[PDB]
Amino acid sequence: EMTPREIVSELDKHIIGQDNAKRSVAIALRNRWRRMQLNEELRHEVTPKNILMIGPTGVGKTEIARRLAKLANAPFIKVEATKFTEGKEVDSIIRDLTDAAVKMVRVQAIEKNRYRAEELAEEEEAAKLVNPEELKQDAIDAVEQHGIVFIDEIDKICKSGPDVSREGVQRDLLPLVEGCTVSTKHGMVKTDHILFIASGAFQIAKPSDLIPELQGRLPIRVELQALTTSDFERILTEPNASITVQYKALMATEGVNIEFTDSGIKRIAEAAWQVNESTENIGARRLHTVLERLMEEISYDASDLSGQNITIDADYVSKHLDALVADEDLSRFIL
Amino acid sequence: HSEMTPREIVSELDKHIIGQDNAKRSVAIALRNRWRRMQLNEELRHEVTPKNILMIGPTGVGKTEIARRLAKLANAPFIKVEATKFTEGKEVDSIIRDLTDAAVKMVRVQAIEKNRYRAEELAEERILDVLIPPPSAARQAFRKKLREGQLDDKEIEIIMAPPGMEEMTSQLQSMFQNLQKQKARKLKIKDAMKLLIEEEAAKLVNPEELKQDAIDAVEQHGIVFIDEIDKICKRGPDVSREGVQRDLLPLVEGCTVSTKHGMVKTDHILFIASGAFQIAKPSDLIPELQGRLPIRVELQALTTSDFERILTEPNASITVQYKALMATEGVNIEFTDSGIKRIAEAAWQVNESTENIGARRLHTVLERLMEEISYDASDLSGQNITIDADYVSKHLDALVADEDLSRFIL
Amino acid sequence: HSEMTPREIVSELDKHIIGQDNAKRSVAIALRNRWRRMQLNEELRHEVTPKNILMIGPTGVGKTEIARRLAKLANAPFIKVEATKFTVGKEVDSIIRDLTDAAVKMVRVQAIEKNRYRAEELAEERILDVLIPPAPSAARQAFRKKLREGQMKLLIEEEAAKLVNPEELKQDAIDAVEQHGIVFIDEIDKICKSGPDVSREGVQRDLLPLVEGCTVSTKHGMVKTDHILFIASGAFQIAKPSDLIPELQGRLPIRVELQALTTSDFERILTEPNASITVQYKALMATEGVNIEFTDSGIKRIAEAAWQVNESTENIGARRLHTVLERLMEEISYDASDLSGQNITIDADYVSKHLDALVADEDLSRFIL
Amino acid sequence: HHSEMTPREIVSELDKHIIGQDNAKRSVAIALRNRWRRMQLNEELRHEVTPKNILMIGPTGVGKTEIARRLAKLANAPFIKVEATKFTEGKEVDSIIRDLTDAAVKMVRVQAIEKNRYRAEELAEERILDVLIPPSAARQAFRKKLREGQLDDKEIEIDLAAMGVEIMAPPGMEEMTSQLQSMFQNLKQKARKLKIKDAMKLLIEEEAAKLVNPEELKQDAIDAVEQHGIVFIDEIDKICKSGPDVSREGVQRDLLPLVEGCTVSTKHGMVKTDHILFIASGAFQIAKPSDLIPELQGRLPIRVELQALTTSDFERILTEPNASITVQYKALMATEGVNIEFTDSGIKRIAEAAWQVNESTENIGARRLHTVLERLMEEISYDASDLSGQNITIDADYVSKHLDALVADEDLSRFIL
Ligand SMILES: Nc1ncnc2c1ncn2[C@@H]1O[C@H](COP(=O)(O)OP(=O)(O)O)[C@@H](O)[C@H]1O
C-alpha cells in the first residue's frame, strides 16, 4: 500500500546509496497493491515483475531484499543457486518459505494472545482463541500474495560437462517463476504471485547466457554500484541501528560511553577500503571484522571502565589497525 | 542468561583450559554480549546478532575444550559437527536438529534433579500400599526397612523402513503407545522401584513447558562448534567444498529450521569455527561467511612446559582421573615433579619424531605407562605407588626410541 | 556390571583363546574400568570415558574371538562391522542401530527363559488351588507330582505376560547398550590414507562422533554412545596407526600387538579350548553312537597339514583348521550312521592318508582346502 | 522337526531328481545330518556348533541349484537363491534374510491352514446355520443335508466383515506404506446378500484368520528360519578380486555377518542367522576359492567340485528324473489327446543335438535341452489339437529332420537354439 517514493525513503533508513535498486524494488511491491484494485480477469493475467540484480559482492543486494520484505510484512527466504547443482530438491525453496510464514503468523498471534488468553489464564486459552486451522490457512494466503524469494549467485548456474548441470538448475527453477503448485506440509501453495529477486556478479557470464524462458520472467533489471570510501563513512553512522550504534549501545550496558570522532570514522573506512584492496574485496562486510578487531580491547575491559567516557579518535584507530593492515599475510587471517 | 563479566569468565576457564588466553577472551566477549543484548531496547535486540568466532591453530591445542567448557559454564546446549560431513548426503540443517535433541535431554536431567526427592517419596509410597493395604506403625516400619535394608530382592506384585525413515517410524510408535504399566504385574522391589520412579517423575514434569524451554535454550543460548572448517575452502572438489559453505550460510545469517520438538530460529545462535588453515587461509572462505565470523583469534601451539601444566592443573585432569581410578582398587598413585616432566617430554618427543597430534599424545602415552599398574591394581591394594622420573624412563624410553614402534603403540 | 578382576578375566579368556596374552590383558583392563567407574562420584562418572583398544596383527590370529568372548563374558551387547562397508553409502549410525536391535533380542531371550520356568511354576500353582483349596503341606505335593508326571497352556500365557512387560524390556535394553555396549570395527587399517583418500578418511570423520560420544536415534528410543566400548583391529601392513586422523588416535589409548600363530598353537586349539572343534566332532559323531579319538601324532599332523596349506598358498590364520578337519572327516561324517557301535582310530597315518595326497598338490589345495 | 534321515537316506532321495554328482550329494547330506546331530547335544554344545557351509564348484547347468532346491524340499526348510552381483550396485545384503523370512512365513501359513482346515470349516458352516434356524433336532438335519447336497445355490444373507485409502509414496517407501495400511485394518462386520456356494468360501477365510494365533504362527516361522533355514548364493565367484575389486570384496564384507551369525530385523520379528545353512556356488574359472577374503573361506568348510555333464548324462536327464521335460511334454500333449512316445534312438539324438550346440557356440549346460526340445516339438505342439487320437512316435530320424538343418548353421544356432 506504501507509495513508491515512501518505500525508497524507508529503505534509506537501512541501505546507503544504490538508488537504482531501491526504485526497482518499489515498482514490484507497488504493483502488488495495483493488482489488488483490478478486476477479476486482470488479477490473474498480471504477474509480479521479478528483479535481476547486478553488482559486485557486498554492495547491499541482499539487505535491500531483506528490508523490503520486512517492510511489507512478507515471508522471505534466501537460497543459493549453486545448492541445486549437486541432493536437495528445487521445490524446497517454497517449502522453507512456507515454514517461515507459519512462524511469522504465529508470533503475531502470540502477541495478541498476551491479553484475552492471559485474562482467562490468570483467571491453551490461546488455542481456544487462536485456531491452528485458521492460523495455518492464513499463512498460506500470506505466501501466495506476499511471498518474496531471493535467489543468490544465479550467475554461477549459467553455461559442456558442468554446463548441462548448471543450466539444469535453471530448468528446474523455471516452473517456480512461471507459476505452479508445490505441496507442503502446511498445505497447497501456489507460486504464481510470488515475487522473485535474483542477484549475481555476472563477471564470468552475462544475463544473456541464461535460458530464454528465464529472461522473460525477469523483466526488471538493475545494476548496483560498488561502494566507495565516502559510502563507508555513511554506513557507519547514517543507517538506523548501524554497527557503531549497536556497539555504542552494547558498551553502554556496562556503563561505558563510546564516542567516535569524525576523523576516527574516516580512518575506520580507510582501513576497510585498504583490506578489500590488499587481499580480497568482501564489500561492506569488512567493516564488521575491522570494528570487532578495533574494539576487542574495549569490549573486554568494559566491565572495569564503567562510568567512563572513551573517545575513539583518528589516533586510536591508527594505533590498533595500522599495524595489522600493513601486513597482508596477517590481514587474511585476522580481518 | 548469566551475568558474568569477561574477566570472571576467563578466570573460570583457567580452571580447565591451560594457556590460550586470547581464545578465552574471544569467547568471553561473545558470551558477555548475550547479557548485553538482553539489556537493550526492543529495536536493538533484533538488529544485534551474535559475534561468531573463527579459531585458528594446530590440532590438539584446546579449541574444542574452550567451547565445551563455555557451554557448560553458561548452561547452554552444545554440539560439535565436522565440516567434512556435508561434503558427501546429509543435510546441513541437521546441525540444528541434533542441537535441539541435545537441549531436550539437557532440560530433562535438569528438571529431574529438582523433582527427584518428591518422585522417590511417591514411588516408595505406592510400594507400601502393597505391603500394608490401608501412618501408624506398620507403614513406618516397612518404610525404614526399605531405605536401610536390601529387602528389594523380595518379589512383590505391583515398522520396517529404509535407512532414511529411522527417525519417523520412532515417532509413529510413540503415538500408538499414547492412544501397559497400569496392568498389575509381578516384579522385584529392586526393579519395581526404578520403574515407579519413572512413572511418578513423568507425571510431575510437564512436556509442554519442558519442550518450550528447550526451544528457548537453542534460540537464546545455542552454541554450535564447527570443527575443521578449513577443509571446505576453495582449492572438481572446489565446487563441492564451497557448496557446503553456501548451505551453512543460512544458519549463521539466521533462518528457520523445523524439528520434531517444534520450530527453532537460529538467529541468536552462537557459532564457533576452528581449523588448521595450513593449506588454505580464512580469506579463502566465501565473502558472505567471512562477514558472519567477525571475531578471529589464533591459538598457539602447546609447549613442553604446557604439557606439564595440562597433566595436573585442570580440574579432573588425566593424572587426577587415574589417581582416582586406581583408588577404587585401593592403590595410592603419586606423580613426582620429575616424573611429570618426563611424561611431558615423552609426548613432545613422539610428536617431533613421527606426526604432531597435539596434546592428544598425552592420552596414549599415559595408558602405555600405567598399563602394568592398571592391570595389577586389584593386587596392589593398600599400597602406595610413586611415579618418579625413573619409572617413566623404564617403560617409555625403550618405546620412544623406536620410531617404527612409536607410530603403532603411542 | 561384573565385579571380576583383570586376572579373572584373562583366566576366563584362556578357556577359549590360546595365547595372545597382551591382548587379553588389554581387554581385561577395559572391562575392569567399567566396574571402577561405577564406584566414583557423580562428577567423575561423566568425565571418565571408556578406554578403547586398537589391536594390531595379521588376519586369523584371534582378534575377533577375543572381542566376542569378552562381551559374552560381561553379558554385553556386541556387533562386528567391517570398516570398508561405509566406503549412496550406508550410514555409520547403523552401527548403534544394529547394536540396539541385537541387544533387544539378547535381553528378550534371556528374559523369556527366566519367565519360562517362573510362569509355568505359577501356572500349575493356580491349578492346585482349584484341586486343594487352602484356607503347601503334603496334599499340594501329592497333586504337584501327579500333574508333572501324569497325563495349563492358557495359564502360562496369563502368567508370562505379568512377568515380562514389553515396555520394561525395551528400557532395560537401552541401559545395556549405553552402559555395557561393545562394538568391534574390523579392518580399520584399510580406511587410512587423493580421491580414494577422501573417501577413506571420510569414514573416520563419520566414525568420530561415535567414539567422542553423541546421540543416535533408533526405533527403540534415544541412545547415547558416550559410555560404549569400541575395539578396532587391523593388519597395519600397508599403513600405520599414525596415519589415522589425529582426533581418532586420541580416542584409541590402549594399543596392543598380537603375535602370529605357530604350529604348536594349532595343536593347542584342537583340544585345549572348551568345546573345541575336535570336541564338537567327538560329540556330533556321538549322536550316532560312534567313538572318535585323536592320537597325539594325529593331532600333530592335522596341525602340520593346516600350517602347510597356509604356507603354500595364502595364510587364513587358524580358520584353516576348520576346513582341513571337515575334509579329513567327510568320509566318517557320511558313514557315521552305518558305523554305529564301532570305533575307528584317528592316528597320524589316517591323517596322512586323506590329506598328504591333497596338501601335496597346491592347485587342488586352493579349491578343496 | 529336524529330520532324522541318515546321510545315505538323503543322497538316496536326491537321486530321484538329480542325476550324477554324487560328490555334491554327500556334501549336502552331511550338512543336513548335523542339524539332527546338534539337536541331541547338551545346552553348551548347541551354541558352539555352527552349520558346515558348502561351496560348490562346477560349470553352469550341472544341478548345483537343483541339489540345493531338492535338499530344502526334503528337510521342509526355507530356501532362497540370490545373485551375489545384485549387491555390487544398491540393495542391502540384509534383504537376503528378509526375503528368506517372508517365504518361510508364507510356508508356515499354507501348512498351518491345510493342517487346521477342518476347524475353520466348523465355524463357517455353523455361522450359516445361525441364519437358517436362529435360536434342537431340526438344526442338526439342516447341517447333514447341506454337506451331502448342493443346496449352496440358494440365496442367503450373512453378516461378514467389510478402508479403501491409498497412500502415495516414493519408490523407497513401498515397504512402510504397506505396513501402515495393516494397522488401520487392525483398528466391524456388514450384512450383505450372497450365495452359500460363494459365502462358505468367504466364511472359511474369515474363520481361518480368527482361529489361528498370530504369535504362534509368527514365532514358529522364526524358529523355522533360525533352526531349519537354508540360503543359496549363486555366482559367488564373480565378487572376487583395483576399481571393482573394492566393490566386489565389499559384498563379501557385507555378507560376512550373515555367515558369522548376527541379527537382522524383519517385519515379522527378529531373526538370528547363526544356525542358517549357506550354500555358495560358482564356476571358478576366472578366480579360485582362495581369492575370497580369509574370514569367508573359514566359514565355508565343506568343499565339493561338481563334474560336467556328458552326452550320456543328457539322455538320463531327459527320462530318469521325475516329471522330466519329455515326461512333462508327453502329459501336455496328453491333454489334447496325443500319445507322444520317445524312442531310445530318438532320445540319444536329442542329447547329441544339444551336445553339439554347446560345443559349437556357447556351453550353457543342461539348459540347452529345453530350447532344443521345444524347437523339436514346435510343429507337434502347434498341431496337437488336430492330432487327437493319433500316436506320434519320436524316433532318431524325426529328431534329425527338425534339428540337423538348424544345428549345422552356427549363426542360426545362437538365435534359434
Ligand atoms: N549500501 C549499503 N548500506 C549499508 N550497509 C551495507 C550496504 N551494502 C552492504 N552493506 C552491509 O553488507 C551486509 C549485507 O551484504 P549483502 O547485501 O549480503 O552482500 P551482497 O549485496 O554482495 O549480497 C550487511 O551487513 C550490510 O551492513
Ligand SMILES: Nc1ncnc2c1ncn2[C@@H]1O[C@H](COP(=O)(O)OP(=O)(O)O)[C@@H](O)[C@H]1O
Ligand atoms: N590448554 C589445554 N588445557 C587443558 N587440556 C587441553 C588443552 N588443550 C588440549 N587439551 C586436551 O585436549 C583434549 C581435547 O582436544 P581438542 O580441544 O578437541 O583439540 P582441538 O583444540 O584441536 O579441537 C582434551 O581432552 C583436553 O584434555
Ligand SMILES: Nc1ncnc2c1ncn2[C@@H]1O[C@H](COP(=O)(O)OP(=O)(O)O)[C@@H](O)[C@H]1O
Ligand atoms: N588364539 C586362538 N585360539 C583359538 N582359536 C582361534 C585363535 N585365533 C583364531 N582362532 C580361530 O579363528 C577364528 C576367528 O578368527 P578371527 O579372530 O575372526 O580372525 P581375526 O583375528 O583375523 O579377525 C575362530 O574360528 C577361531 O577358532
Ligand SMILES: Nc1ncnc2c1ncn2[C@@H]1O[C@H](COP(=O)(O)OP(=O)(O)O)[C@@H](O)[C@H]1O
Ligand atoms: N544332474 C541332474 N539331474 C537332473 N536334472 C538336472 C541335472 N543337472 C541339471 N539338471 C536340469 O538342468 C537345470 C539346471 O539348472 P540349475 O541346476 O539351476 O543351474 P546351476 O546349477 O548351474 O545354477 C535344472 O532345471 C535341472 O532340471
Ligand SMILES: [Mg+2]
Ligand atoms: Mg611393529
